[PDB]
Each structure stands twice: as C-alpha cells, then as structure tokens.
Design a protein around this ligand. Structure first.
Ligand SMILES: CC(=O)N[C@@H]1[C@@H](O)[C@H](O)[C@@H](CO)O[C@H]1O
Ligand SMILES: CC(=O)N[C@@H]1[C@@H](O)[C@H](O)[C@@H](CO)O[C@H]1O
Ligand SMILES: CC(=O)N[C@@H]1[C@@H](O)[C@H](O)[C@@H](CO)O[C@H]1O
Ligand SMILES: CC(=O)N[C@@H]1[C@@H](O)[C@H](O)[C@@H](CO)O[C@H]1O
Ligand SMILES: CC(=O)N[C@@H]1[C@@H](O)[C@H](O)[C@@H](CO)O[C@H]1O
Ligand SMILES: *[C@@H]1O[C@H](CO)[C@@H](O)[C@H](O)[C@H]1NC(C)=O
Ligand SMILES: *[C@@H]1O[C@H](CO)[C@@H](O)[C@H](O)[C@H]1NC(C)=O
Ligand SMILES: *[C@H]1O[C@H](CO)[C@@H](O)[C@H](O)[C@H]1NC(C)=O
Lengths: 728, 728
C-alpha cells in the first residue's frame, strides 16, 4: 500500500542521509559547520561557540567552495573560483581572512590558479603551489619565498603529483609534507619529460567551433614512468635575496638500480622523516629513516636502519605498502603487515632492531591503525562474528597484547556493524560512525573509560520518512566454492517470497582487494531495482577479493581477468540453483573494473546471463596505467607477462557476445580509463558481426557525474534492464 | 515469386548490377576489362583483341590496384600500395611497364608515396606530385624535373588540393591540368598556413598503445580559408642544369579585393586557358580567358574577354559555376546558365562579345553539355514528359537552334528514362548507359546517323535471377503544395494491396539541389525494407531541391533547415491521408544532410513521426566547412547571417525529442561531418533529459563503409526500425 522507492527518488535524492563532519582541533575541541556558521565544540561537556559567523562574507562578492583555518587559529583561508581537474586535483583562488581584525589581507595575496595550499601543522605558515613551483609565506601579509624554480606545465612538478601519482600513488594532488614543528617543508618533485601523452577531444560548449584536444602525460603499462626526487627545506632560515636551499634525500641504492616510486612519506619526529619506496615490479619495498644533522644541515638515512618488505606471493600492501605509525619518541612504529598465514595484522618494529613482533593474529584482518598513545593502540578489523564484510574498533593495551577490548561491537549490534572512527589529538575523545547495516549513526565518546558521551546524528528524520516506503532488504551470507567460503550480498525486493522466481542482477566490481559484500547501508540504483522493479540485485566477493587473507587476494597475481571472472559465473550459477532466482533472467553489470569483468563474463560463453551492462570498462591491460596494472600483471614484455596481457582482453572473446545482449557506455572525456578502451571493444564486436548497444556521453569523465549525465545514464540502464527482464 | 529480397542479399550482394565501363582511346576505339584482361574494341565494326593479358603481371610481386595506359599506347602505369585518404585523395606506388618491349622500366621510377600521377593527354609525358611538389618526366626512363620547391605537409600544396578544395571545389585530389599539346602544365598551389585544424582520435589496431591524433586543416564556416595561386609551366623548355620557370596567372582585380576561390580550369586551345573564379560570398563569379604571348613567354588575361556571372536570388551554379565547352577554335563557348525565368539552359558566348544567346529554353533544365561538334551540340536534360527525375540525350543543330532531336527518349520508353552518355573523341560514337526504371542497358551508337551499333550489356543474367525474387515496385509521382508540383517516390511492397495499411519510412536527404525522387533503378536497403519487411519507403523533393529551376532551388538560400524541413513533414502529412499508410507507424531516416533534416524534423514536434534514425548528421552549420556552408548560408557574423546560423541547430530542438524515438549514429573518424556534430547533439539531449539510442563506429569515416561496419549499421538500423514498427 505505501509508495515504492523509485528511480526518481534515487536520481532526485529524495531520501537524504544526514552526516556529521567534524574536524578535531586539539585534544578536546572540534570544528563543525551548522546552519553555515563555523562552530567549536567542547567534547567533554557538549557546548559550542561560534568561530566564524554565517553572515561574515555576504558582501565578499564570491561564493566560497571551501575553507581551512590556521592550526594556531588566527587566520582562515577561503577557497573560491574552484575549477576541478582530476579526482583529487583542482585549481582555485584564495583570500586570507585575518580573524583578529575584521579584515581580508590585501597585499601579497596567494595568487590565482593556485594548485594546492596548506597551513603548517602549527602556527599559521603557508605553503602553496603555483605553476608547479613551491612558495612559502611565513606571515599571511608578507611576500612569499620561492622554493623551486623548475615548474613547467606537464613536465616538472614540485609539491604536486602528476596524473599517475595523483591517482595511483598518494590519492592526492599534494606532494608537500610539513614537519610537525613546522620547521621543515618536505616535498617531492616529478619529471614527466618522457612520459607519453594520452590525447583526446573535448567539445565543450555548443559555441566552441573547433574541438580542443586534451593532452595528459599518462604512462600506460610498460611505458616510461615519471621519475621522482625528494627534498627538505628548512623554512626557518629563508632569505629575501638568497635563493632557498632544498636538501635532496636520495632513494636507497637498491631502489636506484631501476624504476622505482616514492609511495609514502611520514614525519616521525621534528628531526626524523620516514620514506617508503617501492620497486616498479611491486614486489619489493624499502623504508628509509632519515635523521637531521644539526651541525651539517644534512639528512642521513642509515642503512643499518632500513626496513625491507618483500612478497613472493604477490605485491606489497593492499594497494601500496602500509603506513607506519610512530611512537611519540620516534624510536619505534606499528605497521600493518601480512603474516605467515597470509593475514594482514599489526607488527611492532623497533627502528634500530630488524625483525618485528606481531601484536594481532587470527583468521581476520586489520583494516587500519587509527590512534596510538603510550597506553593503547586503537584499530579497525573485520574480526567481529567472523564477517569480513564487517568493520569495528578495537583497543589493545600495550603492556599486554592479549588484552584487547572491542569498542564498537555491542553499542548497537543489529543496527551498527560497520564503523569508522575519528580520534582527537592524543586519543582523548573519538567520534564513531556506523555506516550500516541500519541508518548511519554518529556518536561521541570519551576514551578515559570509553563512556558514550552524546549522540550527534541519528538520522531519525530519515527513519520517519522511510517508514512510508517499500524498502528492499539485504541478505549477507556465504557460499562454498572448492572448500572455501565466499560472501555475497543480495538486495531483496519488499515482501520477498521464497516460493516465487525473481529476476537477478549481478552487480560486479571484483578488482584486486575489492569488497562488494558488506554491512553498509546504501540508498541507490539497486534500491530502486529491488523496491519498484522486483529485481534481486546480488553482489559477490570471489578470488582476488580483499580483507580475507592473501590466499584469496593474491590468487589473481599476474592473472587479471581470470579467477575473479570464473568465480562471478560460479556464484551466478549457484544463485541460479537457489529456488527464488529465475535463471532465464540473470543480467550482470559493472562500472570500470566492473565493466572489464562484466565484459569478460559476457564473452565467456557461459550461457548463464541473458544480458549485461559494461560502463567505462578496461578492455586490455596495456591501455591502463603502469602503476595499477604492473602491480598485478608485471610488465607486458616477452621476458615477463606479455602472454597473459594478451590472453586477458575483452576483444579476444568478441564472438561469444552473439549469445548475449550487451549495453556498452563510456564518457568521451575519460582521462582515467580511456575511451580508447570502449572504442576497441566496439570495433572488435563490429569486426565479427555482433550487434549490441552503445552510449557515449560527450565530455563526461570516468564517473559520468554531472547532474544530467548521472540521471541519463541510470535512466538508460533502467530501460535496458526492465526490457531485458521483459518488465513493463 | 516466393523468396524475398533480403538484408543479407543487400549486404552480401547476392544480386549484382552488371556494368560496361570503357575508356575511349580514339574516335573509334575503346578499352574494356573482361576478366583481368584489357581488351580493345573497334566501335565501328565490333572486332576486338586482347590489348593486355590478365597474366601479364603474375610475377610483378605486388598486388596491382589500377592501371593507366598512355595516350599513345606505348606505356602502362601500374598503381600499387594504395592507401585511402579522403573522398578522392590517396597515395600509391607506381610502376611504368613498356609495351613495345615487354619490360618494366627500372631507371628513375615514380617515387613511393606518390600523391598524384597523370599522363599528358597526348603522348607519354608524366606529371606527378610527391611530397606536395610537382615533377615532370618527359620520358618514363628519364630523370624527372622539379617544377616546385615550396611543398610542405598540410601547409603548401602544389598540383594537388587541400581538404576543402578536394571535397567542395574540384571534386578531385588533382590540381594539375595539361594543355592538349602536353606542352604547358597548368597547376594551382594552395596555402593553408592559417587554416585551423580539426583534430580527432584514431584508435587503429589493438596493438597500438596510445591513440593517434589526426590533424587536418579544415576551414569551418567563417574561418580563415586557404589562399590559391595559379601557374603555367612550359614542359618543353625544361633543362636539367636550369630550374623551371612557372608563369603565374593572377586573379581578376575584382576577385583580389577579398577572399575568393579558384573554381574551374579548362584549356580552350593549345595556347588559351579559361579560369573561373568565385567570391567567398558565392553570388559573383568571373571567367578569364588567357593567352600565350609567343614572344614574351607570358600569359595575358584580357578584360575584353572577361565574363561575369551573378545570382540575385541565390548562389551561382548548382554546386558552383558551370563548366564551359569551347568550340575547337577557342573563340566561342557554350555553358549552362540560369535564364531570366530561373531555369538552367545552354548559353552561347563569343569570347570578345557581350551577353550570350540562349540556345535552349523551357520549364525544365539542361543537366549537362556532353559533346560538341562542328554541326551539333549534344546534351542531357529532363525535358521528356515534364519529368524532372528523368534524363535523356539530346541533339541541337548548331545552324538552327529550333531543330532539336531526342536521341534516347524512345529507345525503350518503359525500361529507360534515365540516361547518361560517354562520347568517343570527336564525338563519332557514344555509349548510352540507361539506369532505369528497369534494369540498366548499355548500348553503343554512331553519331553520323544515330544508328544503334549493338547492345553492349543488357543485364539479362540479373533479370532472370530477380524473376525469382518477390521484388518491390517503384511509384514515381508528385503532389501539389501551393500551385507547385513536388515529386515524390515510393518503394512499394510486392503484392502491394492499396486497401491494407503499411508502415512508412521517409528516406530523407533534401539538401540544396538534391533529387531523391527519380527513375533510377537501385538494389539497396529500401529494397530489403520493402520486399522482406513490407515497409513502404518514400523519398520526397520539396523546396531547395534541384533541376526544377531556381524558384524551388533558391527557396532555401540563407535559410537551411527551414522550408526543406517543413516540406518533408507536410509530405509525410500527405502520405498519412492516403489509405495505405499506417500513421501510427511513420519513421524518418537520413545520412549527412538527411541526417540533419531528420533530426530537425524529429525535434519539430509535428507528431507525424514515431521515431527516426540519423547517421553522421550535421547539427550546427558553424561546424561544417566554409565552401559548402557559406554557399547557402552566408557568413556567421552579426552583420551577415548569424541569426539563422543560431536559429537552425539540432541542439535548440532537444526538448521536442521527448516525443519520438531517436537513433543517432556516427563514425569517430568522420573528417567531413565531424564526430563533434553528433557529440553536440547527444550532450543537448543529455542536458534536457531525453532518452535516445546511440552508436559510434570507431575509425569509420563519413561513409561508414568498411564492409564489416557497413553490415553492422544496416543490421543495427534494421532492428531499430523493425521494433519501432511492431514488426517481427
Ligand atoms: C568551545 C566552547 O565554547 N567551550 C566553552 C569553554 O570555552 C568555556 O570555558 C566553558 C564554560 O564557560 O563552556 C564551554
Ligand atoms: C589578486 C590576484 O592574484 N588576482 C586577481 C584579482 O586581481 C582580480 O580582481 C580577480 C580576477 O580574476 O581575481 C584575483
Ligand atoms: C621502387 C622504389 O623506389 N621504392 C621502394 C623499393 O626500393 C623497395 O624495394 C621497397 C622496400 O621498402 O619499397 C619500395
Ligand atoms: C609559399 C607561400 O606562399 N607561403 C606563404 C608565407 O610566406 C606567408 O607568410 C603566409 C601568410 O599567410 O602564407 C604562406
Ligand atoms: C641545382 C639548383 O639550381 N638548386 C636550386 C636551390 O639551391 C634553390 O634553393 C631552389 C629554389 O628555387 O632551386 C634549386
Ligand atoms: C544563520 O544562523 C542562524 C542561527 O540559527 C540561522 O537562524 C540563520 O538561518 C542562518 N543564516 C543564514 C543566512 O544561513
Ligand atoms: C627531467 O628529465 C630529463 C630526462 O628525462 C632531463 O633531461 C631533465 O634535465 C630533467 N629535469 C629536471 C629539472 O629534473
Ligand atoms: C579489327 O579487325 C581489323 C581488320 O581485320 C584489324 O586490322 C583491326 O586491328 C581489328 N581491331 C581490333 C580492335 O581488334
């Protein structure tokens, strides 16, 4: 009798999740924007003051995309004129508001088309990047010191990352790293001088008469990669007439025999930096600990102090080598490491010592180390009730590692099974965020005795609303394939009847270390397909999937487009044999790696799927970028892995598409997974006589995320699926 | 007749039309290729011998693409390694083989990657273009002589055309023209320096890691255009110590004031050249007659013998200034001109004398002048039976204009209402080539007494085959919109039943001077649609269409996307009325201009059409080239015609497509109508929320003509129509 969840509701964002985004600003206080005022909250007692009134800047003349306040909080930075580049990078203008006076600073402004800005971690110093060169303001109203002079568009980058680094390495435009004092500015330089350029058309506005070609240095598998150097400047000794002195830190000798990357930089103390590096064959990584010479002004990294990580089974880390979490003193650290059994767990390392100690063990994995005092290490794992799809917070007593307490497990156990966390400085207080399986819940807690303090957002407004809709439900369970347990979720229509036969949509991603079966609450496309269209949407984590150990995750090492594909069919097969899925109507769809897999499934000849959708798919691994692809596939040369690079393309199995119905979609401005990839699939289908559907989306990138293209793509896919399943 | 005309039949060519393609080599001899033998035929008597054995070049080594025999039969040119460029351009390697010995020449071979080669019209001289520069070989075994040194890729073209000139001005890669002596070589040189480029991606074979970017100089409407110069070289005064002297003929003072085109190049005598020039506003045109001053070595264009052509209702000529045909003495010419009633007729000009005299007149038009002798002028017209979609050969006694004989009207009045002709040298003989409405007939005749020498090919082999197919029939009629006859055509289902109600596909082109309603016999897609699917395919010639004089042809001037679009609709509306057309099931389709007209219709909100397909459609005239567009549209500036450039985009109609089902198709490497045109359509559709189906074809150009892509698009289109129409 109630309304169902409709496409419109999805697209028009009718039922909205309420969030609670806070920024810890000390051990006991946090920032929060409410009704557009910036507020400081006291964690302990719950009371708040207004940092910055909503009324301030209503005469400022520009609408403001973002802000960032001094640590030692006398300035606020205002970001405006935001122009997006890639996933993390962008260009903007900035003004600085002097909080003590009622004033914008007026002279020495941070320039326009600034590519990155950062406050120092204390005080109110500023580093910014402009035309690929680094600058430093000591005071906001003073002239900046130029640190580098080598910036050249698309060629040399100081303090920012190039495309592959932004995307595959640091998940960030930034390549600047302030000392904890603020004394030093560490920064990376990239040189893309010989990196080949992916070119593509942008058509933009109807009034542009000639298309623009966009040209992006983008190393595809086996191509010349960017090189990198690393520098540290002392920001306390800058002259106005002397060019600043940047000291180089050289990679270790065992990284210099060949192509390598900088994968991680962590400050350990005021005078010690941690630099992890990686070989290009991502087999082998080195952590260097560099100390600062008081007398010399130099940085030395003692060999007897390096830390090596290797794997014979696969690559180092889930996507990159893990991050070290240092003790206050900087003489030791804790870091996630795959154990002997293949399980990622926390290892305690001493800096001068060489082997490490495991602080956790067992048939589950650690997801992150979240805070560390002298007393306690806080982390997230999927230990609870043995569900890898699950996330919870844990507290180790460091005087005895067997005394672990779970902080989130039983706070709201039917409602909350997927937490993330946000500790204040010195882990005095934390916010918890349960992401599912019920409505998201944001709580505030005091570490002292782990007293719950206060609910922040409970989403009850959403709850009252969703009581009036025909919500689908979620089944999280496992099947068995060859002795091992693999998990799947199903999103099930309202009033699911196990005696009926429902159409089933396999929603696939299945990349190395992915997880599509989990406890989180989403309101999405699947929600609509289940509520209105009575379609079971199923998802399944097969070999190559993560959070369940190496045996499963490294199964796909050097062999993408293989066990992850077979296992999707094997599970679709099994869902078929269950007596509520009508095997005549099984479809499959995926975005991105999802598309590559959906296509590899459509082309397997399984005859299990009526039809499916591949959006922005990888079709051939030589088209994708070096850092991601080489991590799973090695190099595409005869001496290495050319054979399997060639064996695993969507085009190789074009004929088999004649048995299936296929919708193939790709935005033309995809800088990530290039249009070329869908353009080689479509050609291969044509070359063989296979009919299919296509959709390009002019000037859309990898996410096809403009308001219109979003509504349109999901509209297009609904029609393709309703009619695939003979639904009116 | 039981079996039907099948899509496979169309695609696979079960049923081919037989041809007869001859090249005359004198006033009584031609060559025909039968097998891979070149045979010579005596036109008067019918005897024939083998000129060239099919087995002459078995041990050549390379696949031979095409031949060309010198006008003194002494040597043959063999064309190999042919690589397409645009519609007429290509590069190939060439060999010259001696016929009087039996040996390939090996000294001084035509270079590889030769852009163009041609023989002198008499004898065995060669002119050729390599690397944008012109070379002259007096003898095939001898070193060539260099005429130009200014060649340069995509900037300077000598002897060959750039992109616009090839496609829009000359219909030819060639910008060279021998005088009949083979004494003088005349040639144009194009300068594209400031011509902006169209760039698109070309994906190529799989093995290519990074798409290539294609860059072609292409002036869109209003852009900077190529400049031209014209030169005449004396081919007989060449020395191999001295550099070649090229005499320049400059354009008339009234062309030099602004932007202008070189239109036409016609030698009149051994020592006299006709140049036609066209203003960038294409309503003024000047013909210059230019003579060799034996004494000075120069070329003088007297203004006494200059001729002006102006149009006040539209533009000049049909697609350009008509070509003149000079009488042997070089002192008079005949040339097609819009008469004062606005119909195109043969006009008689005397070189030094004013005006001209019209030698034909009426409510019909000369299609072309074909042959000129001492006593007669032969020409082709649509007079016969007031049928503008028909064509016959005609004869005018030069000594009394009123004495006009129809050569072809009555040869076979039922099989044949559509001729073209190929006259021997000195017009002693002609091959009549009948295209319809019955099967093509090919007959040879003699001019003396207009005797029918022999049937050359009667397509009897096809005739018998088709007796066994349930062939569709063609209806040619007309309707009256104001008090004007506009002609349409219908391809009608076999066993047509005027009391059943048939789905209608309206097959549009409808560009300026087009004719879609004629008597030509075709085996094509509509043939399949009619015979196998019992769909009626209708084409209609409304305003802007051709060969019915200027009131109709010029109705569309400065007005593209108005009247012609309106008229298609009104026409479908008229088809509605007739009780054999189901008005729930009317569709429209078209390619190039017809793709544009379709979209424009579709988005008009007429409600007449259920759906429609548009292939490589124009969407916005600013995106298309300058020569074609501005010819109809004027310039896209505010003072000229910007208002109608903006009032006539496909994009401005997007909201209306909600009402219809659209199919939009384009080749990614279309260099004529750029992918951009469709990329802009799809965006506007995305932006406004309209659903529609799409298909790009990667690396296909304008014709979408690789055999596999050809098959794929008709298959795709066939399904789309079949499901639009509720047809299984
Ligand atoms: C962030 C904030 O407003 N916290 C205030 C604190 O500064 C004040 O001392 C206290 C008692 O008055 O109330 C709380
Ligand atoms: C201060 C600076 O760097 N430049 C400009 C400012 O002068 C100008 O008014 C505006 C124009 O974009 O934006 C900012
Ligand atoms: C005939 C000529 O001059 N062109 C060359 C020829 O020398 C060579 O045998 C071949 C190898 O690339 O390509 C062609
Ligand atoms: C060979 C030739 O004609 N080259 C000319 C060049 O000298 C000139 O500067 C340019 C300006 O449009 O056009 C081209
Ligand atoms: C052998 C000879 O005469 N060489 C000349 C060359 O130096 C000059 O640059 C060119 C331009 O006309 O003509 C040729
Ligand atoms: C500013 O905050 C106040 C405090 O609740 C609120 O009433 C008001 O709507 C806000 N003003 C604007 C313009 O956001
Ligand atoms: C960048 O690399 C190239 C060689 O790949 C080198 O020639 C150039 O000097 C380098 N530039 C800098 C400033 O590192
Ligand atoms: C036709 O026959 C005549 C007389 O036998 C002969 O001389 C002539 O060369 C022949 N022409 C052809 C084309 O074979």
């Amino acid at each position: 009798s109630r309304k169902t969840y409709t496409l419109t509701d999805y697209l028009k964002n009718t039922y909205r999740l309420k969030l609670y985004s806070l920024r810890w600003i000390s051990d006991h206080e946090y920032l929060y924007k409410q009704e557009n005022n910036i507020l400081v909250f006291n964690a302990e007692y719950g009371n708040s003051s207004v940092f910055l009134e909503n009324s301030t800047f209503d005469e400022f003349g520009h609408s403001i995309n973002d802000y960032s306040i001094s640590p030692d909080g006398q300035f606020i930075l205002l970001e405006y004129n935001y122009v997006k580049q890639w996933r993390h990078s962008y260009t903007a203008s900035y003004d600085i508001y002097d909080l003590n006076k009622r004033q914008l600073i007026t002279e020495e402004r941070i320039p326009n088309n600034t590519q990155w800005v950062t406050w120092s971690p204390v005080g109110h110093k500023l580093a910014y990047v402009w035309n690929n060169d680094i600058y430093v303001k000591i005071e906001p109203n003073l002239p900046s010191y130029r640190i580098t002079w080598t910036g050249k568009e698309d060629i040399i980058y100081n303090g920012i990352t190039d495309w592959v680094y932004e995307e595959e390495v640091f998940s960030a435009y930034s390549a600047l790293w302030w000392s904890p004092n603020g004394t030093f500015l560490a920064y990376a330089q990239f040189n893309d001088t010989e990196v080949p350029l992916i070119e593509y058309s942008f058509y933009s506005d109807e009034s542009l008469q000639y298309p623009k070609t966009v040209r992006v240095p983008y190393p595809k598998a086996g191509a010349v990669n960017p090189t990198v150097k690393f520098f540290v400047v002392n920001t306390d000794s800058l002259s106005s007439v002397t060019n600043a002195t940047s000291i180089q830190i050289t990679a270790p000798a065992s990284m210099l025999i060949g192509d390598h990357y900088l994968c991680d930089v962590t400050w350990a103390t005021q005078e010690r930096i941690s630099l992890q590096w990686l070989r290009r064959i991502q087999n082998y990584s080195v952590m260097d600990i560099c100390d600062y010479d008081e007398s010399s002004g130099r940085w030395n990294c003692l060999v007897a102090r390096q830390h090596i990580e290797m794997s014979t089974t696969g690559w180092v880390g889930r996507f990159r080598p893990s991050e070290p979490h240092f003790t206050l003193d900087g003489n030791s650290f804790y870091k996630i490491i795959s154990n002997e059994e293949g399980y990622r767990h926390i290892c305690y390392f001493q800096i001068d010592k060489k082997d490490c100690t495991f602080i956790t063990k067992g048939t589950w994995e650690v997801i992150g180390i979240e805070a560390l005092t002298s007393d306690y290490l806080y982390y997230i794992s999927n230990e609870y009730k043995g569900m890898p799809g699950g996330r919870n917070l844990y507290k180790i007593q460091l005087s005895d590692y067997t005394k672990v307490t779970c902080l989130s497990c039983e706070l709201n156990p039917e409602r909350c099974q997927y937490y993330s966390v946000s500790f204040s400085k010195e882990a005095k207080y934390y916010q918890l965020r349960c992401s599912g399986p019920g409505l998201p819940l944001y709580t505030l807690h005091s570490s002292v005795n782990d007293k719950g303090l206060r609910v922040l957002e409970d989403n009850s407004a959403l709850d009252k609303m969703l009581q009036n809709v025909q919500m689908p439900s979620k089944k999280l369970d496992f099947i068995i394939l060859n002795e091992t347990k693999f998990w799947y979720q199903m999103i099930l229509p309202p009033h699911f009847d196990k005696s009926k036969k429902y159409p089933l949509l396999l929603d696939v991603y299945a990349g190395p270390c992915s997880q599509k079966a989990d406890t989180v609450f989403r309101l999405n496309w699947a929600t609509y397909l289940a509520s209105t269209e009575n379609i079971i949407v199923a998802s399944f984590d097969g070999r190559g999937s993560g959070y369940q150990g190496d045996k499963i995750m490294h199964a796909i090492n050097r062999r993408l487009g293989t066990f992850e594909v077979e296992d999707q069919i094997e599970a679709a097969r099994q869902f078929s044999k269950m007596g509520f899925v009508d095997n005549k109507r099984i479809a499959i769809w995926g975005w991105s790696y999802g598309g590559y897999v959906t296509s590899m499934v459509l082309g397997s000849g399984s005859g299990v799927f009526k039809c499916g959708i591949a959006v922005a798919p990888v079709s051939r691994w030589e088209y994708y970028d070096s850092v991601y692809t080489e991590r799973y596939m090695g190099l595409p040369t005869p001496e290495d892995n050319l054979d399997h690079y060639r064996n695993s393309t969507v085009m190789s199995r074009a004929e088999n598409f004649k048995q299936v119905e296929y919708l193939l979609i790709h935005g033309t401005a995809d800088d990530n997974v290039h249009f070329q990839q869908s353009a080689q699939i479509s050609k291969a289908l044509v070359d063989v006589g296979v009919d299919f559907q296509a959709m390009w989306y002019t000037d859309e990138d990898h996410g096809i995320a403009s308001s219109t293209a979003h509504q349109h793509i999901y509209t297009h896919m609904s029609h393709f699926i309703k009619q695939c399943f003979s639904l009116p």
